[model samples]
Each structure stands twice: as C-alpha cells, then as structure tokens.
Target: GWKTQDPTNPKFENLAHYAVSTQVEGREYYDTVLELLEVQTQIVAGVNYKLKFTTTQSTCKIESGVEYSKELCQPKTNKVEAVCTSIIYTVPWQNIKRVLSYHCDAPNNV
Candidate 1:
C-alpha cells in the first residue's frame, strides 16, 4: 500500500532525495504514471489506480572513520514520498517512468 503522506509534516522539509523506477505492477507505479502535460489521469480499467510506492526500514550503515554529519549519523523515523518525472508504458512512444526519493540511511556509530 502507498503510505499516506502529508506534505505539511515538518520532518518532510529536509529528507534526502533517493530516486527509483519500476513497471506498472503495483500501487506506486500506478500513482507515479500520472503527471502534468506528460501523462493524464486517463480512466482505464487497471491503468488508473492508486500506485504503491513504499519502502522498508533502512539498515544502511555510514562509512567508518569519517566525521559524519549529525543528520547522517542518526536513524530516520520519517516516511518518505516519491517524485515521478515520467512513466514508461510504450516503446513506440518511448515512455519512460522516472521516480525519485532519498534512501533512508543512518550510521551505527553509538
């Protein structure tokens, strides 16, 4: 399920951008395929639906022996949102889907 997000969330102000891309097989793909001027929200049986864009808990450990920034040293407890630049559905039209977001990363330094 696409985790419901509120742009008004204060934590959303400064999360890194981790981009992603995938086919229209889940909720994230469906929701991402729509954009202004590039793609319209067409009423199709299974084409137009809430796309599933979700992520798992991060276990990314920061590099060792490095003075990491305060933000990068701490585990994130915020849900992220995806930004889609385009959608890939047709080859003739050369449709390419582009989704972007930040990878949740934190160091195990304690």
Candidate 2:
C-alpha cells in the first residue's frame, strides 16, 4: 500500500528533478526540467517514491562533457512537454537514492 505525498514538498521536488535530469543527461540534445505533479510513498526495506511529473524542454542545449546548470536553463518558448512517471527508492539514513523505473509519454507541442 502506498501513502500520498505532497507534490510540493521540497524533498520530493528534488527527487523528481534528479530523476528527470539523470534520465536525460548525456542523451538529450537539450536540457530538461521537471515540474512535480503528484507523489506517493510506500515503505519497504527502503522507501519507494512514485512520482508523476511533467518535463519541459529548456532553451539550453547540452554540450558534450559539460555539467548541466539549472540556474542557466530556462524553459523554452513554445516548448515541448512530456508527462512522466518514475519510481525512486531511497534510504535516507544510508544516503541512498535510486531510480527503479521511469516512463514518459510522447512529447506534445505546448
């Protein structure tokens, strides 16, 4: 059974961002940013977080070997957006965060 979580919680937002960024890193030609929409938590050996979010294409393009800078990446005008879902497992006491599964719908013009 899973419990509902606040989508606006900073911790959940961070996790949502991490999941999206890691998935797009090194593979995407453009930067991607996430806006968390929903969250659920299940307690197990570690906590499992189920996140629902939307990812928007950013104006910044990815440069090989260059680290992403959120401060510099802004959402693009007439952006493409995708709805995504991810399951993340974490053990805070152990400083562990792992993305177990992730899926995203096809990007739609916005």
Candidate 3:
C-alpha cells in the first residue's frame, strides 16, 4: 500500500495510511483500549504500506467493537483461540510497472 500522487506535493511524500482496527473471527470480535486502535505506517513512509496483526490470548468476539470475553465466548474449551483476520488489498491508481525505494532516514528520532 504505497502511492506517489500529490496534487499539492509538500516537503514530505504525499503520505497517508489507514487503521481499520476492526477484528472479527468466528462468532466474536475484538476491542482495544482506545476508541479506534491504530495499526498503520508513519507519514514519511509512503502514501500507503502493507501491514499485519496478531493476537496473544484465546477468546471469542462478541460483536463489532465489543470486548473479548472468555466466559460467554468459549466455555467448552480451555484455551480455544479465535484468530482475527484482515485482508489488505492495494492497487495502483495508474497501473503500470512501478518501482519503490525505502531508506533508513531516522533511527533515534522517535
């Protein structure tokens, strides 16, 4: 997920990314502490980027934006994990053979 289009190209790349922080696996969904948990690249990366996610504990999804629970979720098994999944699809705005480059600009800046 990257792009090079900029109508008003500024100092940085025409940078933007998305955080679709919705998790739903099996008959359940996942929730974060924040209203909308973020999982995306920084502004300097590109107009887009590819990302992935994971879970550590076993539970079930109640509904979209609902908290994960073990009592009403998975009462039959001990640690039945329900992994949330996401599909990342990106296509070129101007589909042609394109090239991309990345550099280690900053390491101690954060």
Candidate topping TM-score: 2
Candidate 3, lDDT over the whole model: 0.28
Model 1 gets an lDDT of 0.27
Alpha-carbon runs more than 4 Å astray in model 3: 1-20, 29-46, 57-61, 64-110
Which is the better candidate, 1 or 3, if ranked by TM-score?
A: 3
8-80: candidate 1 lDDT, tens digit per residue: 3322221211122222233222111111212222233222212222332232333333233323433233333
Provide the lDDT at 61 for model 2: 58
lDDT by residue (tens digit), candidate 2, 2-55 = 899889898888787777656654544454555778999999999999998877
Q: Kindly give the stretch of ten consecutive residues in candidate 1 with the minimal lDDT sum.
A: 28-37
Task: Give the TM-scores of the predictions, in the order they appear.
Answer: 0.18, 0.79, 0.23
The local lDDT score (0 to 100) that residue 35 gets in candidate 2 is 72
Error of 3 at 54 (Å): 3.0
- Per-candidate Cα lDDT values, in order, are 0.27, 0.76, 0.28
Pitting candidate 2 against candidate 3, the one with the higher lDDT is 2
Where is model 1 more than 4 Å wrong at Cα?
1-49, 60-92, 100-110
Instruction: Name the 10 consecutive residues with the lowest summed lDDT in model 2.
Output: 24-33
